[PDB]
Amino acid sequence: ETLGEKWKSRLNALGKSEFQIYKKSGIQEVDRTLAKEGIKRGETDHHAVSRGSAKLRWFVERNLVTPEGKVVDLGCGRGGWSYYCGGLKNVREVKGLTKGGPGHEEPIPMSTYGWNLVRLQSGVDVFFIPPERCDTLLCDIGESSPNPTVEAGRTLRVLNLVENWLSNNTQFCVKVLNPYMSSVIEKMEALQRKHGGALVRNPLSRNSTHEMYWVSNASGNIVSSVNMISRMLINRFTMRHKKATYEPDVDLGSGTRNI
Numbered sequence: 001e002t003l004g005e006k007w008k009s010r011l012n013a014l015g016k017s018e019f020q021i022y023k024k025s026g027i028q029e030v031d032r033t034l035a036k037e038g039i040k041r042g043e044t045d046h047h048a049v050s051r052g053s054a055k056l057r058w059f060v061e062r063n064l065v066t067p068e069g070k071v072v073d074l075g076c077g078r079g080g081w082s083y084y085c086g087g088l089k090n091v092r093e094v095k096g097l098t099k100g101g102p103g104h105e106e107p108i109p110m111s112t113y114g115w116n117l118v119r120l121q122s123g124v125d126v127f128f129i130p131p132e133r134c135d136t137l138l139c140d141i142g143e144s145s146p147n148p149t150v151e152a153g154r155t156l157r158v159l160n161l162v163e164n165w166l167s168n169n170t171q172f173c174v175k176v177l178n179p180y181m182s183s184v185i186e187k188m189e190a191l192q193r194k195h196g197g198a199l200v201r202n203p204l205s206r207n208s209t210h211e212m213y214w215v216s217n218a219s220g221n222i223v224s225s226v227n228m229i230s231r232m233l234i235n236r237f238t239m240r241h242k243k244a245t246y247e248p249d250v251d252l253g254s255g256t257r258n259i
């Protein structure tokens with residue numbers, strides 16, 4: 001039984017009030033109030049369709065992932081990672097794909113800076129369409145299940161999925177929902193051998209998720225990197241000063257971009 005499982009159980013043995021408190025004990029947050037209001041108001045400039053923009057930004061401004069050229073955003077959701085990449089210097093084209101439809105986040109049309117370089121389409125199940133060509137491959141797909149083995153299965157489906165989209169020196173940021181389950185650990189070790197990078201924990205993630213992102217421009221022993229998070233999450237179960245620290249949201253400018 002891996003350390004991460006010991007955690008997942010305690011997580012689950014949590015009560016209504018408890019869980020909610022733990023979910024955010026000492027984590028980083030994005031101040032989205034006004035941005036959400038500007039959007040519900042119909043604004044399409046500056047605002048980020050979600051908090052994923054900020055989340056991606058964290059990896060990007062630390063060169064853990066350097067999006068350039070043709071960017072494919074698997075499970076783009078409302079557009080958070082895509083609209084954000086749409087403003088990055090070296091980016092030429094960004095194509096984001098999602099299931100969408102009733103009961104799922106649907107892409108929000110925006111006019112934020114570089115928007116004209118962004119193609120967003122729902123009604124697409126990435127697990128089956130054929131692989132396209134891409135310089136950078138982003139993927140934030142992975143549904144959380146109270147059942148750790150369910151998550152691991154979902155994570156394996158995602159790994160193999162991106163495995164088919166990764167050519168030789170492609171930039172990537174792939175959400176690895178459950179990296180502690182024996183079996184994902186294995187797959188990851190192989191994936192690392194083939195396409196380098198390492199797993200990295202984003203401070204904007206909630207404690208209720210043991211998610212780590214496989215980012216290209218970073219090294220680190222997989223087993224070692226997954227355990228440092230298992231311990232962190234467990235330490236955070238017992239907190240004093242369980243408050244989150246916020247930070248301003250990302251401003252995505254507005255208007256078109258020329259090449």
Ligand SMILES: Nc1ncnc2c1ncn2[C@@H]1O[C@H](CSCC[C@H](N)C(=O)O)[C@@H](O)[C@H]1O
Pocket residue numbers: 049050051052053074075076077078079080081082097098099100104105124125126127140141142
């Ligand atoms: N098999 C599949 N094919 C396509 N999209 C999928 C999928 N499984 C899940 N998704 C989508 O993946 C999304 C992940 S959450 C998206 C977060 C986004 N990067 C943000 O910044 O906006 C969900 O909105 C969901 O609809």
Ligand SMILES: Nc1nc2c(ncn2[C@@H]2O[C@H](COP(=O)(O)O)[C@@H](O)[C@H]2O)c(=O)[nH]1
Pocket residue numbers: 010011012013014015016019144145146147208209
């Ligand atoms: N103990 C507890 N765990 C919860 C509760 N809600 C969600 N979780 C745990 O946290 C995981 C995903 O959290 P979520 O994105 O749904 O907040 C779930 O897979 C589950 O194991 C809750 O009320 N109590």
